[PDB]
């Protein structure tokens, strides 16, 4: 318990989430008071994205609705 | 390239967001061609939730609406 540093420094500006395959959403922790959402390509990559950009918030939207109709 | 088994072989049948903290979404792969959500709580654990159940879609919808509301 002396400096912990959040998941994501960085940001990005995407892109279409057919390049995305995983998405992994971190809540509130010891080392980060900020959500920040992580996302990993199907060639095996992972950045960081801003909540704080709308165009964030439609490519994240797509894979969490898409991710039902396919049964 | 022989077998690989989805990372979700069972389901749940939870719970309220209360115990969820971290949210990952799987896309289709090598070992599976369904989406499956799994979820992580704070204690440290792990479960796979079905995206069949209706109650299911409540409390990962949930997770999305409070998860972006922190400013």
């Given at each position: 318990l002396r400096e912990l540093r959040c998941v994501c420094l960085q940001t990005t500006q995407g892109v279409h989430p057919?390049?995305?395959?995983n998405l992994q959403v971190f809540a509130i922790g010891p080392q980060c008071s900020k959500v920040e959402v992580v996302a990993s390509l199907k060639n095996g990559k992972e950045i960081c994205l801003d909540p704080e950009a709308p165009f964030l918030k439609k490519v994240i939207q797509k894979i969490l609705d898409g991710g039902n109709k396919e049964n």
């Open positions: 057919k390049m995305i395959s």
